[model samples]
Every structure is written in C-alpha cells, then in structure tokens.
Target chain A: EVEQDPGPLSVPEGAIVSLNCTYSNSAFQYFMWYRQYSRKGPELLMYTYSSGNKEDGRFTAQVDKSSKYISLFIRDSQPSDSATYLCAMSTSLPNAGKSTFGDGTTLTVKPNIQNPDPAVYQLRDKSVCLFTDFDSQTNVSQSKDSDVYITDKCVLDMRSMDFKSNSAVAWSNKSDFACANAFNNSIIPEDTFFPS
Target chain B: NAGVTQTPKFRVLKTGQSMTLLCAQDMNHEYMYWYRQDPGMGLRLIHYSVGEGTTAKGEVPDGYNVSRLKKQNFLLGLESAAPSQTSVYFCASRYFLPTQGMGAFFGQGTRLTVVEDLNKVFPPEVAVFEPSEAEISHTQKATLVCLATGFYPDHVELSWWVNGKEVHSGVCTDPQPLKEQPALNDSRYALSSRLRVSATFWQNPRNHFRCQVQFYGLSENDEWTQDRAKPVTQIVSAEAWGRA
Candidate 1:
C-alpha cells in the first residue's frame, strides 16, 4: 500500500540481518525479491509464490504465496552484507510491479564508520584558556597523575586560519578558575601549581 | 557509459510554448519510462514504453506525449505549456527481454516550468474494459478491470459495482490503480484500477460489474458495467488433468 526506503542500521560481525514484510492482499500471485548494494541495482534473491522457503548459503527467503507473510534471513552476515534489499510483487506472473513497480520498497544495511577522531570539532567561541603545556616538564608530571595525560611528540594544526598569537592568558584565583573549566579539566588547575 | 542519459537538464517555458524531452540509453533496454517529480507527489509516471515503437499512457499523460522510435531513446513532448507542467522530469530505463531483476536506472532528469497558465487542471473520462481470463495454464481465475483517463495530478477513487450495486463486503480485493494507459491531445491524468472477482462470482449470469471513478477532488464520477460470461469449458486431456 506504500513505499519506503528504510534507513541503515549497524550490526556486529557474525550477526544475522533479517528483513520482512506482510502483504495486504491475496490476489498478489507472484513475488520478486532482491538485495542491492548502492549504485548496483537489485539482484534477485528469490522469486516464487507463497511455501517456497528458499536458502542460498547464508541467505534464506520466506514467501508464503497463499498467506500474508514474507521474510529474508541472512546468517553470518559480512560487511559486504552492507547493501539495500528491495521488495515488490505482482498480482500476476513475470516478477515485474517492485510488474507495474507499479510499488517499491528499499532496505539499507550500513557498516559503522571506522574512525571518528578526524571529524570536525567545532568549539564555537568558548573562551578557552590553556596554561599548562604538555611540553612543559611540570605539566607532563601532573598529567602522569591525572586522567589528563600529555605527550610531547604531537601535532597541532591551525593551518586553515591564522594562529592568533597572543600572550593574553587569564590567570584567575576566584577560587573559580585559572583555565575556567580547564577544557573539560584536561588542563591542570593553577591551584595545583607546586610552590616554587 | 551504458547507462541512461537525459538532455537539456534545465528549461523555462512561456504559457503556450512547446518543447520536447529527449532520453537516451546505450544498453538496449526494452522498457523505458518518463516521470515528473513534484514536491507533493514525489514522482508521477507520465508515460512509458515497453519496446521499440510502442508507447502507453501512465498515471499522468494528458499534457504530454512520448515516443520510443529507436531502441535506445524515448522522447516526451508538450504541445502547449501550462504552469502545472513545471517540474523536474526524469527518464528511467530497465531491461525486460532476458531478465526481470535488473531494477531501474534513471537519468539526471530535466527541470521545466511554464510561468502563467498555472496548475489550473482538468478532469478525466472513465472507462471499463471487458474482463479477460488469467494467462495461467494450470489455474483459472477471473479478472475485472475499470479505468480512468485524462484526469490531472494522478489521483482518483474507483470502486466495484456488482449487479448495479456496490460490493462493500467480501468482494474480491479492489483493483489497485495502475498507470498503464493514456488518452487525448494530452492534458490530464489517468489511472486504471483492477479487481479479481471471486471464483464463483465469475459464473453467475446475474452478476454484472460497474466500474465507477470519481476525480481526485471533484465530484464528477463515471462508471461502466459488464455482464458475466458463462464459464468457458476448456478441453483438458485426462492425461493433463491427472497430474493437476
């Protein structure tokens, strides 16, 4: 009665991804079902009338030609399993509406994005202050004790914009902060400064 | 390069101006279709072709005409422009001769707009075609059909009438609308709805059918009716029946 392209979902390795549907009418005489990787069109997984339960390696299809149910079962699914599954039917033969697609349904399977560190981290104007430097011997010693660990052999890129060089570091003793919230407390509190 | 392609990705028309839309493909696909996308309906089938030199109407075909002259290209044309015709047009092609699962591939699509005539639309004329038997060798089923043509915007409501009365209960499932035929100098929309009468319903001579169609929003309704045929007795070899 309607058409939809389902959003993608993530599944772990060795997982099973199952797709299913319930048709509203019995006049539907033929079913043509498929799976597709984006850019690649649908590949027929199975085409049959409703007890024609079918299996191919890890892929299984359920079509009850006389009933109101259909399902596709994929066992031990791989990352290559990441693709779209298409569903369609016809009142008559010739695996063609989904012959007159004449209704169409799209299913998406997505693999998780591997790395998130490189994504844009925008700190839109949060007046951040940095006093304790990792390269500084004292800060390094402090990091060894706190969750705020620091390393010297590192890289910092401000290449996209001018590195606003200013010595305007605000040191506050409002018992409040020297580095305000201390950038999620990664920067050590000035109160912890060892007496020289 | 063996994919579908559309020409003139963009166009603007004056009310009453005319133009053609060209769609080409490199693969020898047997089925090609033209569809227009509007913000509301998403996409509506304007017309389609199943093979070279054969074209048929779809959900909306009134304001447009289509032709499939070469095996590779299909053309859509507008004789006069109207504001409602303004929308992105898409050309899609799929193969049918050797395989059925290839799905459909689409072109980048063409966008057109007619500035003045507006979407001031028109209604359709309704029709009913005689019911034919299904094409199955092992089974026999009844088919009932009614069609609506020349209505714009691709929406209409149709129902089944048996013996001059509406069948509200346990009637065969209502025919789903199929955008399969066309009509006129091309100005509106058309949809064909089909119903499969129950097995016993096909044999009762007292049983007659009327296909009624009401425009999407207008009160205009049209209907057609037909009488049931005595079930035809096909000669079945006893040899062919025992295996059945």
Candidate 2:
C-alpha cells in the first residue's frame, strides 16, 4: 500500500512545484511520473527508481526506499506545464496487472491547457472492435510549451466487432494484446496517439 | 530542472577497451537508469539503479558494473567492450510519486563504436504466439502476439499486415527498450507487441498475418522472415488452454 498527498498547487509562470510519494513497502523499487493533460492521456515523463537518482532536462526524480519516499521537481515552470501529475511505484513491474499510483497532484505553470487508462502486458486473444480509423487532419504545427502536439480537429467514429470463442483468459498479463475483427474493426472518436 | 543527467556526450571504445558512462541526479528520487541508442532508431536499457549501494545486474549489466554511493552519481563501467555493446548511451530520470507521473528529460546522449563498428548491426529475435486460455478477450476476438525479444537499441517499428496487405487497426505501445529482470542476466530488450484483429482473421488458417519490425535499418534484403505471412497463433483450444 502507498500514500500520497494530493495537492492542487498553483504557481506563477516561473514557479516550481515538487511532487512526492511514499510507499509502505520497502520492496517497492520502480517509481515513475506521468504527465497528463486535461484531454490527453498520460504519457510517461520520468521513471525514477530506488536503485539510484535520475534526471532529465529541468526535471528531477528521486526515490528513497529505506525511508519509503519519492519526489519529482519541475524547474522554471511554464504555462504549458499545467497538468495532472500522477505518481506510480511498484515492487515489480506490470505488477498485479496494475502499477500502484498515487491519487495525483495537479499543477499550473504560471498557467496552461491540459489533462488524461489501464492496459497491460497480458493475454493475447480477444477481439473487441475492428477497423482502423485513419486521421484526416494531418496538419502539423509546432509549439514551444510542450514537446509536439497534433491538432487533428477531424473527428472519427470507429469500432471493431467479432464473433468467436476466447473463453478462459486472465484479465491481466505483462504482455499487452488486441484481437482479430476482419474487414471488420478499428475504432472511434479521435486517437491522439499515433505510432512514431 | 532536477532529474537525471548523463555525461560525456560521446565516447569511442575499442573491442577490448574499458569505459564508464556517468549518470548523476539530485535528491529524493528512487531510480537512475542507463540506456543505449543507435542510428538504427530506438533506445535500449543498459543498466539501472534502484537505489544506493545496491546490486545492478543483467540487461547489459552482464559485462558492466555500477555504483551509487549517494544520489548524485553513478558509474557504469564496461570492463570489456564488444561490438555487441557498441551504441549511443543515454541517461534519463522519471518523475513519479504515486499514480501520477511526468515524462523524463534526457541527456544529449553518448555514441560508442566497437570492433564491429564497421560491421552491420545485429537484428532482433522474432516470435509469434497464438492466444492462450488466459489470453481471451471478452468479445471473443482471437488475439495474436508478436514478440521481438533480445533486441538492441530501441527504434523498433511494429506494423501488422493481413490477407497479404498491410493493416493499421491495432493497439501497439512499444516503449523505449526495457530490462525487466536482472537475475535473468540476459542483455537485450523484449517487446511482446499484441495485435487484435477480426475473429475471422483466425477462423481462416489460410489468411496470412505478419508483424513487421524494422530496426538497425535492416531492409527487406536482410533477414526479415519473422514477419513472414502465415500463422503462429495455433488454435489448440483444449491443448493450449491447459495451464500455467
């Protein structure tokens, strides 16, 4: 079990916010932070581990297993830095099919537009919806605030359906999967993620 | 601005050469990680530290050793350099607390070339498996698994093709290379990419389905049969659903 302080902290354009988490189990080693915008799904930000300290750009992640504490620091925050930051730590990866996540803290960089599932490394066979929805709005624009954002206003309504028998399957596994649909499936609304 | 940082933007090592990749960071963190990247495309997890004064193993840690006296520094040393270990090294840090997370910032990255630096890059091992009893979907769709294991330098491109044509309707999240177990002592990355298609895709054994992963610039002229058309997700039903 783990405990986290969910604070909706606000800072000016140049302000900094510190996010932290504590795990009751000393065995918990893998720790990570994901940044999720209001309408966007969370993307991996930092993967701080108990083995040692790690850093990137102006972001720093530290984890102390002995004391059972972990923290993430954002340097020179910006308006685009606003989003919900989720803290996740685990003794094992893909553990219990779900990583232990803190309630999450919300931060505003001077100001910003933001926020966003489970999925796992498990069982393969099982079809849900079928059909691949291609994006029509392929327009690309560059912004300094975030890495790269795709403004695809094109809305797609997609779905995949299939009929077969995949009876015995665990809901969770380390290996992730999708099933067969035929001239049949792929699905809906708009998918912000595309394979790079 | 307090996260992980890597040192020595670049390094060149001989086959028998010895070198150390440095990773440093600030306080109140959990883990520090080391990975390698190549012109080929993606990144590979080389070594990682869960904390200070701890054991670092496998995933490239086989020939390399690491030491974390405190939180500020770590030394990942390669006692013996092989072409197998040649690539650009990168250091990254994670921002994590509980359920919330932020993306990691990366160091400029380091490039290293070994004995075979002049030779070709190694390709990954590819395997495909049918769905398991525990692998079934609620909608009764057949699942097909394409696993690219023990590959080096991430830059992996996973694509699916069926009925002799390319299919793009699937959920594929291939992260930068990762080292899951240190005890296994295996140095390389594994991606068990799952692709779900129409149930009819499985109903007809004659229909061909392929998963194509491009790495190290291995063109169609190179070894590329792993993505060959046909079937690997055998429908044993009772035979496959037996157990653990």
Compare the candidates by TM-score and give the number of the best one: 1
> What tier of docking accuracy does candidate 1 attain?
incorrect
Chain A TM-score across all models, in listed order: 0.48, 0.53
lDDT of 1 by residue, A48-126 (tens): 6555776879978778756567767788876566555656566754433223331233332322322211110111121
Model 1 residue B101 lDDT score? 42
Task: Tell me how far the alpha carbon of residue A56 in candidate 1 is from the true structure, in angstroms, after superposition.
Answer: 5.1
Candidate 2 residues A1-196, lDDT tens each?
6566667676655666788877787667678786756433345788865566787888988887778888888888875677778776657553321245576777755322111101112333422212222222122122222211112111111135321111111111223323221111213224322211
Tens-digit per-residue lDDT, B72-130, candidate 2:
67677889888777666766554344333333544556656564331223345665556
Instruction: Give the residue spans of candidate 1 off by over 4 A.
Output: A2-15, A33-51, A54-59, A73-85, A93-110, A113-120, A123-196, B9-19, B36-44, B78-90, B94-96, B101-244
DockQ, cand. 1: 0.01
Clash numbers, per candidate: 14, 101
Model 2's CAPRI class is incorrect
Cα lDDT for residue A136, candidate 2: 23
